[PDB]
Amino acid sequence: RGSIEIPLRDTDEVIELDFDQLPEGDEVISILKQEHTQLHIWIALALEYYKQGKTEEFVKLLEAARIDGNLDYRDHEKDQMTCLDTLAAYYVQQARKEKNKDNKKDLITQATLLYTMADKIIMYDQNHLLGRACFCLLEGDKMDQADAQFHFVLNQSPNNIPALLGKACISFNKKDYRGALAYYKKALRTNPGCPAEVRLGMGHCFVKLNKLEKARLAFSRALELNSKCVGALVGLAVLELNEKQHKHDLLTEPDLGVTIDLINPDTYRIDPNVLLDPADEKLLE
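Above: the chain sequence. Below: its structure as tokens.
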């Protein structure tokens, strides 16, 4: 599955951690602290815990790295941005799910303070702006502000999947659903391996754009790729029942069920081998 090398300080040796053998989160931290490990390694370990579903290990690694992650290397700043923006992004995703109103407000505060201090390191780091953009969507009428940040990212990186998904969502909420569908379609064409929820959001465009048919094929492709996908079950199970447009207004979450993943750098990595599979190729016509 993989391993990571931890340079032992004042030595030419190294200790390997096997990812299938991931130690207790708390002892890893004392190791990286003891060997004054550079920040970039702390982050690598933390994301691996995130991938293995070991979430509190991931949180505690990166919070610890803010104190004892060594910065004695060129481009450490970019790693501080990754560390702060990934902490912030995670707290936001906990905030959406959390039901204690008081607890949720604390998560938001933590994300706010993290983004504010990441502002003072690399003001315009692409990932950072994607974080602030999605954070604008989280709540406000910061829709215009989020739109400007997403749009600026595509004026540097036209194929950036998070920015396209962000533009699609904003397009939909201002009810330009041809534009929202185009954005979603470009996301999926560009990165055939993208999350199942991309077709979910295409579904909702395919519903408001009165193309009821592919709307169902979109929702179905989502459940095929992740049978847990709920807003698509909701989606299909309201194609049952024939303005008409409104009943489809309030089953749709504001993020149209499409969460933009700012934590796992893999979610939109583009393997040149993965090819468009015909069920998506039909939705793209």
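DSSP finds 13 helices and two strands in the chain.
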